[model samples]
Target: IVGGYTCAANSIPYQVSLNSGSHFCGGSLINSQWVVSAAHCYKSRIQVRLGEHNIDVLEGNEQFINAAKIITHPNFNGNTLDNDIMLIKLSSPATLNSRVATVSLPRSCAAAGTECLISGWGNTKSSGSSYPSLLQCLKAPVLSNSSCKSSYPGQITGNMICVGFLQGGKDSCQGDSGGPVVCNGQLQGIVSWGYGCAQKNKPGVYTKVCNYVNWIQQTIAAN
Candidate 1:
């Protein structure tokens, strides 16, 4: 199960707006003061709307907090698309409500083979159009280190986790990167990269949040 209360598409805890006039999939509140999403989503003047859904139009019923600073993982490489994670600190803490709440990060690494939930407004099918309204989610089984390593070979690194179907039907597609991969009701990973958008035998890869715990803590502490 995806777990947690699903926030509105336009809310601060649930939304990320990309510069291309498209919305990138992202997760909600990690803390009252911070929002977590993929580092790649960081761009000049990129806006993070907290409590609404429509990208072009704001209904003005939610917290709509803006970023004061965008912290992408220091080790993140845009070239290889590795270490693809980021944290957005709002200029001020967001006002919480029923549609705006934080999801806790996993205290430790999750066991392999555990199922996780991934959601996004990414294309429903390969080369298909993006979802126009409401977010969509899918269930994927986490691959063990060995199986994941064997499947992706050079691509599976200690910093990443793999999840998807071997038969290859559902997955986090393009524009879905940098979103949350919820496992056991906690934020365990962020959608990072994959061979392609929903390609067969190529499962979705995510930055293992546990591996970056120290970095996240240090960054938060320093800020």
Candidate 2:
């Protein structure tokens, strides 16, 4: 399973939530008005907490924003978790501060072997449950397109990129999909899939953010 790590000061957006009563595993704030995350993380209502590291308990040091509307990717296939991305329109724009800000999406596809970081509130060990509080993150190197294609054998399309350890024992778990995969301070990819939590020869698969840039821009523009 994917391990949990805390966010740096105000590093996370405060307009996202997880499945009801569960920790948020996937979310990102595109701007003051929109939050990006995976569709599977949706709940009836979520409390957005920003500028804080500890997610287990709320210290009231962050902004609590409510989702006004949810926009899931139209082609998202829930069965296989493909096209799992989504957007959340906040009821109001979040006030920017030293600790609260938005992350930038990639303008183009990253070359093979780019190093990236993935963060979330998820299970620390394989076959375990989600953590009550505290977020987890790890730095992983991007896999070469050829390597990914060879490993997955037809699964790694242009829309996806591969990251994680080839030897296994580390990867995104059930709740980690749709979370940010950042590289060079830029949003590089979105956690999408893996064979199983930390299984040998199975690296984590991610949605290629560059491929969706236009789609995302259009979605926000329509709002």
Candidate 3:
């Protein structure tokens, strides 16, 4: 989070850190064997840390696993960041415990103005290059796509949902991409991209998770 503080260790058990010796992006554990994140974070050798809260010290709750596969959306666009979501198949199923579990998906698209929660280990300051050692959490309201288009014309579409503080405040940043955007306790969006962290009016764009429910189910079933 850009303008957020440390989150409770057990607050978001499904959160996962995509690391290559260090933190790069955030992901969500959807099941024992699958973790979901951003496509742009795709890399050849990525590992995941589950039940992680503090990166500075090793916690007993932390579980490290090498990705068996990085399943990216075939239609992912690097230039414009369309369909920027992916799944990481774990080499082995996760061991569910009090500090580790999976998140649930929303039944429908998030409604405008819903108070959505976002958590990650992204950059703390807009100009800062370092990521926080502790997990960060922030709340931003979902903006109607119509209202969001003013900042990014012809960019926000059916596949995306928008969120930000119109007045300029709390939001996600670079390394936060691919993390979960939960609304009403249900997974609603995937952090995709944004112009600047917590910028005024320029709401963060996310992959509408509800729109890809069937696609996710199909992909998981087929593979």
- Candidate 2 to truth, TM: 0.88
* TM-score, model 3 to reference: 0.96
How high is the CA lDDT of each candidate model? 0.69, 0.72, 0.87
Per-candidate TM equals 0.85, 0.88, 0.96
Order of candidates by TM-score, top first?
Answer: 3, 2, 1
Worst lDDT run of 10 residues, candidate 3, spans 123-132
After superposition on all C-alphas, the RMSD of every candidate to the true structure, in Å, is 3.6, 2.4, 1.1
Q: Against the hidden true structure, what lDDT does model 1 obtain?
A: 0.69
Candidate topping lDDT = 3
The Cα error of candidate 3 at residue 21, in Å, is 1.3
Question: Model 2, 155-222: lDDT tens per residue?
Answer: 66677788888887778877666678888877877777778778778888887777777888999999
Give the candidates in order of lDDT, highest first.
Answer: 3, 2, 1
Tens digits of per-residue lDDT for model 1, 1-223: 1212233453334444443345655645677777777877777555566665554565675565567778888788887667888887877887777666677778889998888777665666665564544556677788877766776877666778888766566677666666778888788888887776666677778888887777877887889
Per-residue alpha-carbon lDDT of candidate 3 for residues 111-198, written as tens digits (9 for 90 to 100): 7989988999888886657778889998888898788888799877678888877777678898898899988989998999888887
Candidate 1 TM-score versus the reference: 0.85
Residue 59 C-alpha lDDT in model 1: 66
